[PDB]
Specification:
CATH topology of the largest domain in chain A: Thiol Ester Dehydrase, Chain A
CATH class of the largest domain in chain A: Alpha Beta
Distance between the termini of chain A: 6 Å
Largest sheet of chain A: 10 strands, antiparallel
Order of helices and strands of chain A: EHEEEEHEHHEEHEE
Strand order of the largest sheet of chain A: 1-3-4-5-2-7-10-9-8-6
Structural class of chain A: alpha+beta
Shape of chain A: globular
Helix content of chain A: 10-25%
Oligomer: homodimer
């Protein structure tokens, strides 16, 4: 009744921060994926491949289709932060995993994440309903579906359509054999990292910090595919930051990652990012109310 | 007399390992640089820039010109490892920082590192002797120069000359604004990561693990420079692994990283790597003999 969530502590490292010594969103996402994977290790153990364990999932795979992270205050280099994660039922096909990024010293809430996970068949990449025998077992580790770290009305919003070519275009990135996790799949955080290279350079230079990100994970690349990143503004004030210029408002951008060959392009990830110059660190409430 | 070394514990994360679930040499090097930087924080504090603190070094910079890492057994995903670091006097211009990579569970020694650090003038990139007033203060935190984690006769060996173009050539990598540490300089581990993309794909595929690496750090890139990686075999048995094929011996390769423009190329890093299919984890001895 209190082991329905999983908590880990990490110290923000020197190579994990931007010049303002604040952890990058890549570093935050890395911590979210590490604690989530360690939650699975605590539940089903450390198997011969790493992913959950394939117990009654021998040909099934958990795939995150939506990730939403809202940041209230970025931790700094040297800070000991705590990442608390849990998952709940989401309909009859999906699961909702959420994260609490917390400062250990003050106990305050630095950021919140929520996500949508489905089960696809490994040998068909097609959706597959977990057997009700199996789903009842996962939910033994789940808190009630009434638990929300972010307002549900502010989650699961459809992303705008991507106008192509993007106004900003990061150079052809090349997939490497290093950018592969232990399962052979490319890392989710790697898609996030490539996606944010398409952003205008004047956004980070202007002192804007990423306040919220909404990612749709649509397709997967492998090996050494060519990868292109496009970015579009979403309102006029954000369009001001594209290229050089001739109580501040927030910026909105829509970025997209795709793999390209001599046949056609295939969209990998789409992301809507919210940018602001100021935020505010908040205060939590414990999940043992269960 | 026991605070002359600095020890930190870390858990190898899921995204830090190769498909065989062993930590990559990039992950090891990342841990070496994090503990070394935290040693400086423990000595001179966390300053407004991060690098040491510029106390009587207001226009001075510590630059590592040689890094040598020997691996006895790579830790695996989930392992809690300990990194112990210290530095000693190295002549009258350089300092020798060394690392002990240890498994916390067994106490055994997983790997050893040693390095050479000089002081260059920030505003001239030219070498500059630290004042003897200042050097005497650093060495208060140093063990005697007789301390060696690796045999001195096996360190500080001149690397072979690089025949160009290399037999293997990784694609033009592009420097990004993300690949910059908090000081604006590109990260040492980033040079290491780029350098190992030039390796033949059949080396990692053949089950070979990096046994030792010797890096010379020669120049620095910035911003969005074009970066090229070349690799050459050093003996005939290693030359067998270049491209496809028509109690095992170790492989030897010489890799080089350079930045290129429309004027000329400038060498950044040169690395000699030793590759073997088997290693052996060893046993340490404490530094408090001081």
């Amino acid at each position: 009744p209190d082991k329905r969530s999983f908590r880990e502590e990490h110290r923000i490292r020197g190579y994990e921060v931007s010049p303002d010594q604040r952890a990058t969103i890549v570093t935050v996402a890395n911590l979210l994926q590490e604690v989530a994977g360690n939650h699975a290790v605590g539940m089903w153990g450390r198997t011969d491949e790493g992913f959950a364990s394939l117990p009654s999932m021998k040909d099934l795979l958990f795939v995150m289709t939506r990730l939403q992270v809202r940041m209230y205050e970025y931790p700094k280099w040297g800070d000991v932060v705590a990442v608390e994660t849990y998952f709940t039922e989401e309909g009859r096909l999906a699961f909702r995993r959420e994260w609490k990024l917390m400062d250990v010293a003050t106990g305050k809430l630095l950021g919140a994440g929520t996500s949508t996970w489905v089960t696809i068949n490994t040998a068909t990449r097609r959706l597959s309903k977990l057997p009700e025998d199996v789903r009842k077992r996962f939910l033994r580790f789940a808190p009630p579906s009434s638990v929300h770290i972010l307002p549900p009305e502010e989650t699961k919003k459809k992303l705008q359509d991507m106008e192509l070519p993007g106004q900003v275009q990061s150079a052809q990135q090349v997939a490497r054999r290093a950018d592969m996790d232990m399962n052979g799949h490319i890392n989710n955080v790697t898609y996030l990292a490539w996606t944010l290279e398409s952003l205008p350079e004047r956004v980070m230079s202007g002192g804007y910090k990423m306040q919220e990100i909404e990612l749709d994970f649509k397709a997967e690349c492998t090996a050494g595919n060519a990868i292109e990143a496009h970015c579009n503004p979403l309102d006029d004030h954000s369009a001001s930051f594209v290229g050089p210029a001739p109580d501040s408002a927030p910026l909105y951008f829509l970025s997209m990652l795709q793999k390209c060959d001599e046949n056609g392009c295939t969209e990998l990830v789409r992301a809507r990012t919210t940018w602001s110059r100021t935020l505010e660190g908040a205060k939590p409430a414990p999940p043992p109310l269960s």
